[PDB]
């Protein structure tokens, strides 16, 4: 895989490219491409020119790193993600993730869309990320498989603390005072590999599991984030309710998807300028 | 693992090689391999003779495919299949099935043994497969993972619709009209990896997750089945009932498998016979 | 698939064999914070794991990385002070490779031991759970040491698992255990493996909860799998070294520090508990 120099490397170079000094990054996920565009002074990077950074392949994912400042506050931003089934080991998924932390970021904002799992949930509903559930992980699929670098963080770290609880009450507390609108849900996410959408019997699985919502990312990036002690904040936009019988002839699809989150952007745009407002500044 | 140039090498050597032309193409599972005595105009290919298909190693796996007709449709079988187990990854698993599809088959029906986990299933009985839980497929082993060709289909396919739902209605109906004894079961399967056999805990832990029947194939294939526009028809022979409690000296194996294969021959060869009248023609010959 | 031949497991065993004059009937895997059992063995023969022939190197704090031959209690015993886990790189069959190894020098009986987190609220810290029972999670999604062909020299293609712990071991210890007035039962439950090497979330916890698990590691369960492949009478149990968290309002947090901690604690315990379970070992039929 990768040498802790790699890491270095990638961090040194974007370093010297750039006067942009980042305390938070942040991942845009499938159709959420649209929360760099309230970033100030951009300046863009593809990741085609950012040594050992992977592609994003998936339609939705714009694959570039944007350094700017939202809502006066400086950023690095993610426009596209990778994901395991896309072919990609989970230490090149989660590659940035120490990168960030070599740059000087201290906290990660994990985004993404997600299959309703909960049947509380509409499309168009932002979920607050209380914890998850790593189904790859329980079988080996962890990208902290492998020798430990100390210099990232321990060997066994503990995971139960993950979402950060203070920015989660803040955000709560602050669409409480709204009243407009859909409230702010909040719940657990399952990351599932794919690339398949689930049937109507993993559908109730996941469910019995205790999940709220569904996905195929984000997971490891959290773990890897947590490893080297990142304050992590999470939260998924419901793009679909998941099928969950077998009456239906609706049927999960990648263009809905899309079009929830265009649908949403002015939204997700709010809420995020309003999340980075209850980011601590650094000590 | 496999280019697009592989899979065509593959269907123009066996179209060059046999004037059969399938619309059906059949999977036989363990002690299953029997449902191609009925062929008629049979022409058989050993495996290790079609390039870049993959090698059965399995007991009860004979690793042949033959074209014929059953019951006056034009099918290919594959008696015999291949595992994850076996040291296979999944596209070679489930090369077979895109192969298939370029020969111009339009229907895949998956079989195989399975051990029944709902209590209400008998040694014998046919288990219609409505739906089924990929737990491979959670952790990342899903034959569709990697970078996707749209020759073959979707980045994304859904599967909440993966096993017809016409044919299952029709096989039903026609079957509660024979009269016979055990009623044609229907359920969800469980893919695990094998090879060993479940615990006490394992069996307890797919019953609660819903699951009626557990085996070690079948679903790989009909992910790929369906990423590239196949129907799918599938269904389970039980062949044992998994072990439930910690008192019985039972233990599962694979001979008893295939002992009950042998027993229920008579009742599948009439079950696939009429499913093969529950399968649509064309819309054009 | 498998990277190991049958003539690498040979070549281990008759480098051992050709080595020591010890001749093993029990094997003992001592995991994490538990390599203290190897202390009571008289005769004792040590050997480094990093000279053994194939041998793979354990990488983990509390994880000696000696095999140690001897007699516990006057059996035939040798003993692996440390072991190897998934989560450190290790493919299943070198995580398995000593397993086999032990086979072939005439071993007949694995006493597998490791330390766990707590799932069923009714376990204390400290407490000794006998496995009645396993859920190999990893195993169900492909990470399975029998993967690949199968040599016939081992065992069969598809071997049964529900009765992986030896019924009669565990009904003589528990027996033996309670004449001996011990304040504290001995537990007994289903282990659960998850590869790691993260700490569970509290919804995993209760994922694991709802799946019947009673405690909760990450490792073991390869171990066995590969033992009742090549027919080794199999016997289990871990050390409850912590409870795993199960609300959000907890300010505790699983750490490997308070793991090994917690066998330091246990180990007079454990001392004890291996003696009720050496006499409880049957003979082979011929010496
Ligand atoms: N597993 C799963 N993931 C999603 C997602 C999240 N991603 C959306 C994209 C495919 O549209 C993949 O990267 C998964 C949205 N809806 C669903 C769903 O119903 N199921
Ligand atoms: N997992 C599992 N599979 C089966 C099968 C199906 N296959 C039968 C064959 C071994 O007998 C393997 O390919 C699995 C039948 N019974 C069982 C069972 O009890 N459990
Ligand atoms: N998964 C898991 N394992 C353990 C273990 C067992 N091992 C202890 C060591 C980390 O301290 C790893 O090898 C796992 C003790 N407590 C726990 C727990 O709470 N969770």
Same mark, same amino acid.
């Given at each position: 895989?990768?040498?802790?120099?790699?890491? %270095?490397?990638?961090?040194?170079?974007?370093?010297?490219?750039? %006067?942009?000094?980042?305390?938070?990054?942040?991942?845009?996920?499938?159709?959420?491409?649209?929360?760099?565009? %309230?970033?100030?002074?951009?300046?863009?990077?593809?990741?085609? +020119?950012?040594?050992?950074?992977?592609?994003?392949?998936?339609?939705?994912?714009? #694959?570039?790193?944007? $350094?700017?400042?939202?809502?006066?506050?400086?950023?690095?931003?993610?426009?596209?993600?990778?994901? &395991?089934?896309? #072919?990609?080991?989970?230490?090149?998924?989660?590659?940035?993730?120490?990168?960030?932390?070599?740059? *000087?970021? !201290?906290?990660?904002?994990?985004?993404?869309?997600? *299959?309703?799992?909960?049947?509380?949930? +509409?499309?168009?509903?932002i979920?607050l990320?209380?914890?998850?559930?790593?189904?790859?992980? $329980?079988?080996?699929?962890?990208?902290?498989?492998?020798?430990?670098?100390?210099?990232?963080?321990?060997?066994?770290?503990?995971?139960? !603390?993950?979402? !950060?609880?203070?920015?989660?009450?803040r955000a709560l507390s602050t669409y409480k005072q709204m009243g407009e609108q859909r409230e702010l849900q909040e719940?657990?996410?399952?990351?599932?590999? *794919? @690339?398949?959408?689930?049937?109507?019997?993993?559908?109730?699985?996941?469910?019995?599991?205790?999940?709220?919502?569904?996905?195929?990312?984000?997971? @490891?990036?959290?773990?890897?984030?947590?490893?080297?002690?990142?304050?992590?904040?999470?939260?998924?936009?419901?793009?679909?309710?998941?099928? &969950?019988?077998?009456?239906?002839? +609706?049927?999960?699809?990648?263009?809905?998807?899309?079009?929830? *989150? %265009?649908?949403?952007?002015?939204?997700?745009?709010?809420f995020?300028?309003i999340?980075?407002?209850?980011?601590?500044?650094?000590?």
């Open positions: 895989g990768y040498t802790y120099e790699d890491y %270095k490397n990638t961090a040194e170079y974007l370093l010297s490219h750039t %006067k942009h000094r980042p305390q938070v990054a942040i991942i845009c996920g499938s159709g959420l491409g649209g929360l760099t565009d %309230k970033l100030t002074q951009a300046q863009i990077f593809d990741y085609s +020119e950012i040594p050992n950074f992977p592609r994003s392949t998936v339609p939705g994912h714009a #694959g570039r790193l944007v $350094f700017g400042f939202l809502n006066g506050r400086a950023c690095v931003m993610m426009q596209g993600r990778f994901h &395991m089934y896309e #072919g990609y080991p989970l230490y090149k998924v989660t590659f940035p993730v120490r990168v960030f932390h070599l740059l *000087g970021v !201290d906290t990660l904002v994990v985004t993404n869309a997600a *299959g309703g799992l909960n049947p509380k949930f +509409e499309v168009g509903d979920m990320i209380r914890d998850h559930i790593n189904l790859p992980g $329980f079988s080996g699929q962890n990208p902290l498989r492998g020798p430990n670098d100390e210099r990232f963080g321990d060997r066994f770290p503990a995971m139960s !603390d993950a979402y !950060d609880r203070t920015m989660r009450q719940g657990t996410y399952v990351m599932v590999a *794919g @690339p398949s959408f689930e049937t109507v019997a993993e559908c109730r699985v996941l469910q019995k599991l205790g999940a709220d919502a569904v996905g195929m990312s984000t997971v @490891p990036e959290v773990i890897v984030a947590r490893h080297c002690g990142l304050r992590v904040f999470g939260f998924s936009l419901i793009t679909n309710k998941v099928i &969950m019988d077998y009456e239906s002839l +609706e049927k999960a699809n990648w263009e809905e998807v899309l079009a929830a *989150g %265009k649908q949403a952007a002015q939204k997700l745009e709010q995020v300028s999340l980075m407002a209850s980011i601590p500044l650094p000590d």
